[PDB]
Ligand binder design. Sequence first.
Ligand code: ADP
Length: 341
Amino acid sequence: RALSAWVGYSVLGAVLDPTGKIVERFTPEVAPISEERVIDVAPPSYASRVGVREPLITGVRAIDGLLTCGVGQRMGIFASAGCGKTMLMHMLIEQTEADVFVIGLIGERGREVTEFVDMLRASHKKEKCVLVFATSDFPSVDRCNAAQLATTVAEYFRDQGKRVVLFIDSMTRYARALRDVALASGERPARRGYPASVFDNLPRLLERPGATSEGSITAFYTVLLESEEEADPMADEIRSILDGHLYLSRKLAGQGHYPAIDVLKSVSRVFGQVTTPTHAEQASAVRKLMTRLEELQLIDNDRAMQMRDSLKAWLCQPVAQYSSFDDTLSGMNAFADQNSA
Ligand SMILES: Nc1ncnc2c1ncn2[C@@H]1O[C@H](COP(=O)(O)OP(=O)(O)O)[C@@H](O)[C@H]1O
């Protein structure tokens, strides 16, 4: 399982199978610069990293205002079917300003992999993106190697001083792949099916992104919620290792409200660390306003109803639209002024 892969500028604008071989390109080769690297390497020493200080502007108002991410943070995207998470990923790719984008699709159906590649084909920052994939037809070993290879490419470009963003689709599937790889060997599984090595190996992958002296890997990890929430232990044991999490709602999805971000169910554990005190005050004000508006739900009724509509309209944002951080904060200020009255 512990394989070596060839990474570098040669795979910029390219699709990789779980072994590091280029199986497709959507732009010419940027430069023939490569490196052989072990894809299951240990995370950087806790004493060598720099703290999550700077924020990462993702262009989305619901994130920049109430859930601001940090350069080096490890965010989670919690979704079920039809919550709109893949268009959220493409939105983040388009709007965010970063040197390199690295997507890692794990256990996805090959149709969806092709669809995402074709989406990357039309992006105007396509030469920055590197896709790594492992379809269902691949063994669990290769689905695991896919996420490890994506993290390794991100690490390569981090050591080059570049600002790197890393997506991993379905951390659930990488967890299940580690579980299956361990179970295929002599490993004992009484903990909800997952043996001991799974819980040591998940954070080993999660603790690799993060800011360094120069160069950084901000990472997003997606988690499937099934359609129950009564039986979902892996989601909650994954949320604990993340520096925040994004909750996507089937409710606002069925409404047509995208990004289907439930702001109240979400948090960025680096928000206060990457936001100015003014922004931090306005965020708490808008949070109180939202909790008051949803707490009320069963001339004082009319104003508050038009206010709920105004706020939900401000939170809604098509992937075409882009909002700068200044305008985002200008909207935050208005919806805080409303809380002050
Ligand atoms: N600009 C848009 N206008 C209307 N609907 C949109 C737009 N962008 C995304 N959607 C909705 O997002 C949904 C796709 O969700 P999807 O990303 O496939 O969720 P998942 O990734 O969890 O499968 C579609 O049903 C579509 O209605």
